[PDB]
Structure 1
Amino acid sequence: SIINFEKLGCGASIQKTPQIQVYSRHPPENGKPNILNCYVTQFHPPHIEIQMLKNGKKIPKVEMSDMSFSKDWSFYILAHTEFTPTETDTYACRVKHASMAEPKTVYWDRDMGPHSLRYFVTAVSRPGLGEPRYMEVGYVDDTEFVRFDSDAENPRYEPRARWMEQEGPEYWERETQKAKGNEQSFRVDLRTLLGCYNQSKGGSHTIQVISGCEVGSDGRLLRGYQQYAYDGCDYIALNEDLKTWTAADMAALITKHKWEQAGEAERLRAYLEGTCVEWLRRYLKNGNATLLRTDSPKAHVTHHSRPEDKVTLRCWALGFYPADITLTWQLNGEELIQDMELVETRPAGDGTFQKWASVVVPLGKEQYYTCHVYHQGLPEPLTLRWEP
């Protein structure tokens, strides 16, 4: 259960480039149906246009994940489409974003314990196009379990995991109505931040909050979060002592001084130590079965033939959960950290993740290299070698 937010009240009335990977859900064999993904990350502002192209031409039925953002405030989203890969068909993903002069097209190539309850809030103004879009997204240990999105005709808190369905009607009504009250607080703050940052009234702007608690096995609060960003930059944050605020710039000093006078750190302390902890506990009971599951990586090495007497070994980790993983190549028992290539961990789209690490080795020397896979679901690290 998210807190009811206090208005920022900063006083009476910057862009990040997307990163793109394009890859299939399952290893591509020609003729068999599959899923092509276009994973876009690290971008701000959140408005973005993503097209998937087949042989130069737009692909019509392209589904898209709901948009999320990460602890560094940048947004991310998964686009995907069904496709049956063939030998000569070319696929690609094209991204239009205000941080880029021109749309970026990225082609697909067929080779190359403690617990937390956190809420991720977004409010984006859209002058001329509608009311600000407001979202609340709840995560129990990085698993999304509830969501409120204002862009519906009758906005409602929705379960996002089957184990939330057992909460009664009284719960969803209370959350829904708290969300609509929260929505109005951010609408007012979006108006007000314009003056505070001396901005024009026709531009789109963004408020983001991360709010919640991390709780140890003993049931005691390990860390509390209440941090705000305006246009993708720190604005204000409760300190680890849960008594004082860190204001990232001058406009936030007005909010801080105000929240000091109002005792807002103390209201947060109480929510964080009590209410947040107690609800986390409740969501853990409901989700007991599913939330604790891990899936360990199945790994394998692939071989790719380069110019001259160099070859590339690629080490793959597929179908693992959670996303945290380490891949390393070794030669003679030393790690080749400084000369190997790797991709950012990426969702398969069925709820699990993929990663690979590659190294360039001499032709005929493939059996001198060993790949290591470290994942928390493994009883023991995996060790693998290329094999024909």
Structure 2
Amino acid sequence: GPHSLRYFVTAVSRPGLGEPRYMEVGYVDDTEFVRFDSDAENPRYEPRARWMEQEGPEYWERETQKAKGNEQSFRVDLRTLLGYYNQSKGGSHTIQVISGCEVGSDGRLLRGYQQYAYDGCDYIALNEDLKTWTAADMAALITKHKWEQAGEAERLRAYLEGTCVEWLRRYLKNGNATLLRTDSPKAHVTHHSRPEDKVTLRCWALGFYPADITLTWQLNGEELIQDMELVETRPAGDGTFQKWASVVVPLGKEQYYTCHVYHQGLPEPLTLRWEPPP
């Protein structure tokens, strides 16, 4: 399928408490592979996917120094935005960036992007065309004209169309062209009391990777989305994820309901019912 190289940047000021916190995290298809954190004892670019241990000490030395230079830019950004938004030097503020490219199965670019946020709100973004910016408020307007003047979009474009793409392919190499590691869900149903002529059937999907999954409850072929309770998918802490969906049903009609689990690791979706222990 498609593939992605994304970098997620965070700089957060903390007046009084010391210099801005600065973080760079890299992702190949949602999988974190490098990370920098300026609050570490020794601030360097560190491998986070063991397949990254393939790169030579130069790589790390040179991306570390890149992080340090980025930290300076964002630290100055923080100061600049206090001017733009007339904000106090004593408050805590956050800058975020998501930057990256998606290339196709053929290895061609399908989309370059770079998005900025300030205190959690969109600030400015590069358009589909890789040529123009979309500002979200008056302050971002000032940024947009400066960058248009400097032609920054042409320079970003070159990164996205080239550098980004080539390393994406390169990282895909090392981490295997389309690393679909896969643990299919182990599913089961539990049974729980309700205001007592009612019962709760809870369908569990456990130990699965990756996070994408779908559980449904069916009554005579129909999907009960109204009345289903769902939790957000969550990490077990060991690399896999968990989810459940529950349904409140009349006492004694448990066998009228079926749970369905859909996941790229499943040859065929799972079908299951409440089983009274034989």
Q: State the TM-score, normalizing by the size of structure 1.
A: 0.70
- Which structure has greater helix proportion? 2
For 1:136, the equivalent position in structure 2 comes to: 24
Say which SS state the counterpart of residue 177 (structure 2) adopts: helix
| 1:270-306 CA distance string (max 9 Å, x none) | 1111110100111111111893211111100000011
Say which SS state the counterpart of residue 11 (structure 2) adopts: strand
Question: 2-side partners of 1:290 and 1:216: how far apart?
Answer: 11
**Cα displacement (A) at 1:195:** 1.3
2:98 matches 1:213: no
| 1:314-334 CA distance string (max 9 Å, x none) | 000001111011110000100
* Aligned-residue RMSD, C-alpha: 1.2
2:9 matches 1:121: yes
Question: 2-side partners of 1:123 and 1:314: how far apart?
Answer: 41
Question: 2-side partners of 1:347 and 1:302: how far apart?
Answer: 20
**Cα displacement (A) at 1:132:** 0.4
Residues 3, 178 of structure 2: 8 Å contact kept:
no
Question: 2-side partners of 1:239 and 1:378: how far apart?
Answer: 37
| 1:33-53 CA distance string (max 9 Å, x none) | xxxxxxxxxxxxxxxxxxxxx
**Cα displacement (A) at 1:308:** 2.2
| 1:334-372 CA distance string (max 9 Å, x none) | 000111101000000000100000000000100000000
2:201 matches 1:319: no
2:245 matches 1:245: no
Instruction: Choose the corresponding residue for 1:187, options 75, 85, 93.
Output: 75
| 1:203-230 CA distance string (max 9 Å, x none) | 0100000001111101111111200000
Say which SS state the counterpart of residue 203 (structure 2) adopts: strand
**Cα displacement (A) at 1:154:** 2.9
CA, structure 1 residues 275+216, in 2 after alignment: closer, same or farther (shift >3 Å)?
same
Say which SS state the counterpart of residue 291 (structure 1) adopts: coil
Question: 2-side partners of 1:318 and 1:329: how far apart?
Answer: 17
Say which SS state the counterpart of residue 344 (structure 1) adopts: coil
Question: 2-side partners of 1:325 and 1:222: how far apart?
Answer: 25
| 1:114-165 CA distance string (max 9 Å, x none) | 0100000000001111100100000111111101111134311000111111
Say which SS state the counterpart of residue 180 (structure 1) adopts: helix
Question: 2-side partners of 1:127 and 1:318: how far apart?
Answer: 43
Say which SS state the counterpart of residue 201 (structure 1) adopts: coil
Residues 124, 136 of structure 2: 8 Å contact kept:
yes
Question: 1-side partners of 2:169 and 2:133: how far apart?
Answer: 27
Question: 2-side partners of 1:290 and 1:167: how far apart?
Answer: 19
Identical aligned residues as a percent: 100
Segments of 4+ in structure 1 off by > 2 A?
Answer: 289-292
| 1:94-124 CA distance string (max 9 Å, x none) | xxxxxxxxxxxxxxxxxxx001000000000
Q: State the TM-score, normalizing by the size of structure 2.
A: 0.97
For 1:68, the equivalent position in structure 2 comes to: none
Question: 1-side partners of 2:36 and 2:124: how far apart?
Answer: 24
| 1:66-109 CA distance string (max 9 Å, x none) | xxxxxxxxxxxxxxxxxxxxxxxxxxxxxxxxxxxxxxxxxxxx
Question: 2-side partners of 1:192 and 1:346: how far apart?
Answer: 37
CA, structure 1 residues 290+254, in 2 after alignment: closer, same or farther (shift >3 Å)?
closer
Say which SS state the counterpart of residue 240 (structure 1) adopts: coil
Question: 1-side partners of 2:177 and 2:241: how far apart?
Answer: 20
